[PDB]
Design a protein around this ligand. Structure first.
Ligand code: CA
Ligand code: CA
Lengths: 408, 408, 408, 408
């Protein structure tokens, strides 16, 4: 019985109860996805490629129906023609919003990439602002909760859509649970039932037994190289929601008069189907992994957020080293414990629009994939490193144990 | 020699000189494309796939540079993410136009699919109109020429872009040659040099030694399942033009902030490169075929448009039988002389937004591809059938001779 | 707390200790495969396709080196040019064996497919017998152990190779553990160290911490649509062993004078790499699944083999219903609880060379894949059904719970 | 007109009549292939992938039937599993031959790669010799014709198969026309009608209106990265012949008991069908190019073989410069006028089993493909360079004119 092994025996026993809970959620979600395959009568011919126009591609259409069934929506859009999560989100915004309309984000300022999209960052690019669509965001209370009086003050007759970002992303606040989201929807719908509630669902898929579309969200969007891709999707994004709303997204994604009826699937179907099927289980690996990281690092006297015993709604997990050297050594050890490009150590790197260098471990099968184990953060006080994902719980245990042995 | 063989010997001698000119154009164009590959140092690594976000895909970028080199533009956008010619065109319009801007098509009303796009066909789908962008079309003169006085009267200070459709499509007018297009461009630029000239270039690629971007067009667009795909591209579209304009198109195709810097190529690069290399030559097969069809049908007392000895700028070829039966029999024979689904008899079919039944031969490798031999037309007087494309001149001669033998 | 749920709470607590052991093995094996990726410096460019001859395909070569590293061999052969497990095995036999040589199987008669291969079933097909290569097999003792005196009697100067089939397959004997195999190797090597020991390793990969190549096997072969494909490999087989021996296999697989240096990888690399990486973990799911099936069925008074508490060396798991109806209802429920073709119920089916109908549940992503959950058996006393595989432990729990609710 | 242009005008007029005959052959062959697609009811579903074992792949089977129809054989084996022409040929030899049998090549010693296969090149690799199969070759007469008395003397009762190599390869003799091959076949069959006649058909496909299987050959084989692949097949080989013989080949390609009934097609079907459809026409480009090269070089006082006005049966074309410098400069110029890796300067290179350095131009889409334009030769007197292939006649004219301009 070694050193670190002793610590592991202890910490693993400690977290076992919560890990078991994660497995209960995974079985529930696995059944849910299986039921969705089944109600849509998925067959092996549904993996066949389409070419050219992609008209009447039943494989593509069936997959979208499977997505809609799982999220409990009327319709979905899940294609490689949606190139990412950001692209999926932008498709929702431009798809629905029209000149004179206003978008209100209530979960505080959303992730930085949306900056140019809404138009508060650049010019001439074709932002919402360029198309006469208004945008604002309501900051969170200091405690990370929604500032309801502030939201109330902001909602006007011109407010067409309310934006909710489930995951904290890089923001210093807790990710919003489905219960918290339900409360937000109830609140806005009580003010105006016609207001469209959109939730940026990235990293939350299959973390709970429920999704935002089950607590009244009208439409949601996410990334296929995160949770729902199950580690297999090579690219893409998804949209799920009301039929009228998904129709609009489709016209934005292709063109009016064609919309979602068109777009060749080529060779992407099998990986999307199989990835979705495995997604509940693979998500469970990343969650189990996060709790392990949180428990182990805390044990080694390192600050963890969230806490190993925190409620979980997404995959996000950070650890604050309060040490530049410790942070870099850890991120490098994570790369060194990765399957792909393990020998290409990350270093402090310049990043456009940022005053601080960033460090990123990304030894993955798919470029930029996040359900896979990665690590990153800005190199500045308090030296917070995001260490999350993992295709297997085994991989996370191995990598984190080695990262500890290497930096602490 | 059989009878038909005797007619062929005569007709083939008659058109030889023109077929030779087509071959001369093919060699010029083949050299143009080769020089572009060399200039851009095309390598086998340029065929490699990219996954995830598709950042720093040199293969994708190099393909784009090759397109730009051939079309003699600063920039190009060429990728699987563009699902068709219509999508390419829409991307140009929404990419460049903004609220208060006006689009003026000068080549008469453009192809029907653009109806919904501009907003004269529906409501609420996110048309140019829905986004406060103005549109109009100047009808052609009765002889099919541009109505210059009408054009002059409709150009205002708010006219941001001029639209030109090279190919006649289904319009009862001749396709516009590069020389004619040059006249148009010179004219509108004389009125306002800052006006953006866009040419829908479908079916015209490699038919002449020059493209519209060489006669003053600022930006062009087309489909990869037509000419530039060389029969090999399974899907896609292209945009080529000035860097500023192509940048704007990129933000529309993806999102602001990202643009053309993202989008996984997956496995599509090789077919696009190889198809483009083969495009000048495959285009020539389709043109030689067109001339054969025109000359043979005329010889059999059937009306052809264009005439065998007409100037050619695109692939479009029609024959008018003034007989329902002959028209149907001929189209059926074309399907029967096609490689794929030869046994699937075309019959009068309903087409959305069409009072008349249509008949179509589409026995192709790629779904809806048109550089391949196809035949189609609405079932009504004067019973005009479009018989065009052909991956090989041999295929067209065989199919057409048999179609004649089966219907006349 | 429901009926069956109560039974599950009980049985799951009971099997927990062994399941945990399976997870320890999985973590060890995950580390082992990770270490193999790392020592071979696996990078994202190693997933790139090769075409034509496939000469100097580093992606293909690196993968084979990763396989060799994991199995602790000098060399391996793992390509889609090996179309299956049977093909892999036959390649080993014809690769090494020459006229006058004799093959001796000591684990009793091997699986039926090898019948034509060795030549004890047909004629003129090019069996070992057709090529003047001898074959025999030593039956097991009644207790399922190796009959060592019988083996000793059989080994002659002409015995070039000894065959060992690790997995019981359909045979009514226990699968041979690695320790048992070590004993066999020691025994034959003591008689003649020059005798080549070959192990058919199908279904045993990653079930223990060790493989036969670690207890002295010279060469091994298996299927990529079983354990090592991790559920992702679309086809294939592998060979691993001594360099001289793998060289010979390569000449058989391609041609002499070329061998393994050639063969295009096309698009198969990523799935093979990623599948191998996930294989320890996915294998663990199928093992955990088997123990669950064994424990649950036994609880419902149904005979299980192996027992939930048996030592495990492969994925094989059966249950004997002593009831035709119960057996068929169970197999059908397994299909109905599968992701693909769930609505296509299996029925009693004729099978060539068999007196009895067979039933097979195979609602899988990959045609004929076995790491995925399936069920099959011959429809005859005692109505033994093989219920094994599972990409996730969750899937197996769900499917088995439903199969019980449906047939018992 | 420039000078070179003046020479071209003259030379092109001179060869026109022969180029026209090539086009006539192209049309005949195109019709032959089209009729085969029709006869076999080729459908778009025939392009669908198969996974796993590849059982009941109708697309794969239909492709095989199309090949058989074109070659006028009972059966064909055409698949990605055959990695080359050599592999196809080896499969035929080991598939049919058995211990005590003898193979007699009558067209002199065949291509070098077959050396190891037959067993006159190495030891222990599993050659025909290692498997107790006899081999011999009858040298050609000095004029390159068959030595009939020597052939008669070497045919015995143990002569199971007669080998005929259509193409000269690197041998200093003319390629054998179908008429010549017919003479050979008639002769050997007169000696023994039960003798199996095999023709290595590489580079000869679609060059004449007839194939060897139409002049008595029992079985033939070739490469898909040459003629029948139409420039599109990324890998592979074919075997066509009598059902009994093709059956035997199947058991060798896979295993006895299984044969041709197995092997996943994955994503290779479409390119194989489309390539075969285009093959007659692409072949014609390469032949027209060959004639252009022969006539142009001769016009410039360089020795050509074959001569511009020679009978053609395959793609092979050489030119002898009697100058190292000119030879090297010309090959370099061909690479520089190639689409892929144009910038990668060919230089004298070592070649295993060759005392002399070789130079090669291989700037192709598919690695090692030869229907595409390439150039190669050993660097030694009389400095003979093979300059052949070409996906388009335009490409050859451009490359060759530039090569002339750069070296002469
Ligand atoms: Ca001017
Ligand atoms: Ca005779």
């Amino acid at each position: 019985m070694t050193e670190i092994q002793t610590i592991r025996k202890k910490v693993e026993q400690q977290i076992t109860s919560l890990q078991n809970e994660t497995d209960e959620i995974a079985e529930f979600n696995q059944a849910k996805v299986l039921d969705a395959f089944q109600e849509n009568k998925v067959s092996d011919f549904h993996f066949n490629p389409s070419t050219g126009y992609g008209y009447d591609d039943e494989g593509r259409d069936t997959l979208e129906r499977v997505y809609a069934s799982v999220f409990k929506t009327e319709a979905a859009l899940v294609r490689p023609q949606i190139i990412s999560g950001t692209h999926a989100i932008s498709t929702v915004l431009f798809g629905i919003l029209r000149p004179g309309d206003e978008l209100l984000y209530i979960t505080g300022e959303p992730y930085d990439t949306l900056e140019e999209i809404v138009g508060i960052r650049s010019e001439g690019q074709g932002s919402l602002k360029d198309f006469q669509i208004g945008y604002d965001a309501v900051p969170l209370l200091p405690n990370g909760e929604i500032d309801y009086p502030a939201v109330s003050k902001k909602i006007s007759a011109n407010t067409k859509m309310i934006g909710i970002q489930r995951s904290r992303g890089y923001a210093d606040r807790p990710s919003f649970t489905i219960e918290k989201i339900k409360e937000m929807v109830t609140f806005v719908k009580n003010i105006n039932p016609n207001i469209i509630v959109f939730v940026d669902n990235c990293y939350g898929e299959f973390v709970e037994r429920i999704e935002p579309t089950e607590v009244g969200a009208d439409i949601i969007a996410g990334s296929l190289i995160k949770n729902p891709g199950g580690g297999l999707a090579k690219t893409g994004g998804y949209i799920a929601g009301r039929n009228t709303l998904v129709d609009l997204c489709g016209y934005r994604l292709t063109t009016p008069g064609i919309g979602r009826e068109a777009g060749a699937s080529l060779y992407s179907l099998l990986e999307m189907y199989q990835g979705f099927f495995l997604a509940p289980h693979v998500t469970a690996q990343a969650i189990k992994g996060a709790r392990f990281t949180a428990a182990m690092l805390a044990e080694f006297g390192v600050e963890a957020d969230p806490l190993w015993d925190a409620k979980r709604t997404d995959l996000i997990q950070s650890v604050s080293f309060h040490s530049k050297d410790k942070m870099i050594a850890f991120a490098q050890a994570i790369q060194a414990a990765s399957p792909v490009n393990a020998h290409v150590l990350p270093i402090g790197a310049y990043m456009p629009g940022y005053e601080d260098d960033v460090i990123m471990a990304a030894g993955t099968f798919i470029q930029g994939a996040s359900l896979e184990l990665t690590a990153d953060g800005p190199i500045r006080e308090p030296y917070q490193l995001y260490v999350q994902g993992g295709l297997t719980y085994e991989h996370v245990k191995i990598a984190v144990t080695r990262a500890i042995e290497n930096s602490l």
